[PDB]
Design a protein around this ligand. Structure first.
Ligand SMILES: CCc1c(NC2CC2)nc(N)nc1N1CCCCC1
Length: 154
């Protein structure tokens, strides 16, 4: 049992777009944009929808760069997060009820104010490698187990 989610990183040669989640799940951490995939939309549809809702941005092409499965102890559904990246965007990012967007230089990623797993898989993202990840959490701060590999098809 899995539930589908999306995550979108706008990564340009010298900068990456992150949003400070302002409420709800993951509040207080920088992250890419995304969320639950709804019934009746593809995963990539959901990624585009969440990006528009959370930043106002639309994109021409999203690229599948990773998949990360998360277990939280005591939670019955695994989280199957599909990670997309894009370089080209359409528009200027603007704040939403959910997200406060900012550009970060690639050597100034705020890892200590991001999900703990990002420290592990974000470099592969930055090196433009495709990857499969798995992280077991207790609560929101403690990774108990993890696996991470580069793959050829996401
Ligand atoms: C919680 C999953 C999660 C995460 N996983 C760690 C297990 C805690 N890392 C990062 N960057 N984003 C995550 N989300 C992006 C998709 C919507 C849900 C939050």
């Amino acid at each position: 049992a899995s539930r589908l989610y999306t995550l979108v990183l706008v990564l340009q040669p010298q900068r990456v777009l992150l949003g400070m989640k302002k409420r709800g799940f993951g509040a207080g951490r920088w992250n890419g944009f995304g969320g639950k995939v709804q019934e009746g939309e593809t995963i990539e549809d959901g990624a585009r929808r969440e990006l528009q809702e959370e930043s106002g941005l639309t994109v021409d092409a999203l690229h599948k760069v990773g998949q990360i499965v998360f277990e939280f102890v005591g939670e019955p559904e695994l989280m199957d997060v599909h990670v997309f990246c894009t370089d080209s965007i359409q528009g200027t990012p603007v704040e939403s009820d959910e997200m406060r967007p900012c550009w970060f230089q690639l050597d100034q990623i705020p890892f200590k104010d991001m999900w703990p797993d990002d420290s592990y898989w974000f470099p592969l993202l930055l090196q433009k490698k495709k990857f499969h990840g798995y992280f077991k959490f207790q609560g929101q701060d403690t990774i108990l187990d993890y696996t991470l590999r580069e793959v050829d098809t996401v």
